[PDB]
Amino acid sequence: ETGIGTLIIFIAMVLVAAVAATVLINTAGSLQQRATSTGSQTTNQVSTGLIVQSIYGM
Amino acid sequence: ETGIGTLIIFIAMVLVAAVAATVLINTAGSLQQRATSTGSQTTNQVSTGLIVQSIYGM
Numbered sequence: 001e002t003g004i005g006t007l008i009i010f011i012a013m014v015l016v017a018a019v020a021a022t023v024l025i026n027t028a029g030s031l032q033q034r035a036t037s038t039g040s041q042t043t044n045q046v047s048t049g050l051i052v053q054s055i056y057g058m
Numbered sequence: 059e060t061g062i063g064t065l066i067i068f069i070a071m072v073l074v075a076a077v078a079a080t081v082l083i084n085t086a087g088s089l090q091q092r093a094t095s096t097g098s099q100t101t102n103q104v105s106t107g108l109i110v111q112s113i114y115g116m
Contacts, residue, residue, distance in 0.1 A: 002059065002060065005059040005060050005061060006060050009060050009061060009064055
């Protein structure tokens, strides 16, 4: 009967959907750390600087 | 069995997803050239100018 064949494919459908879910989570986690670090590094880059007061010679 | 019907629809699902992918790429490529040209033309527009030095009559 059709009942047996339906159950077999059902298991396969669940496993496939889990794979595509894993890709999206892993990619978002990788891009999270890069975007956070870039923002913090740029903030330090703009604000920091050195200034010359006076120059003397002998 | 359900196995035969699943494979047929699978092929159709792949082909449909390719269509929507093509739209997004083609649109982004069209907007790329317009945005690039607008920026370059405006830069030339602001910087360029003529100046009058002196006027003499007879």
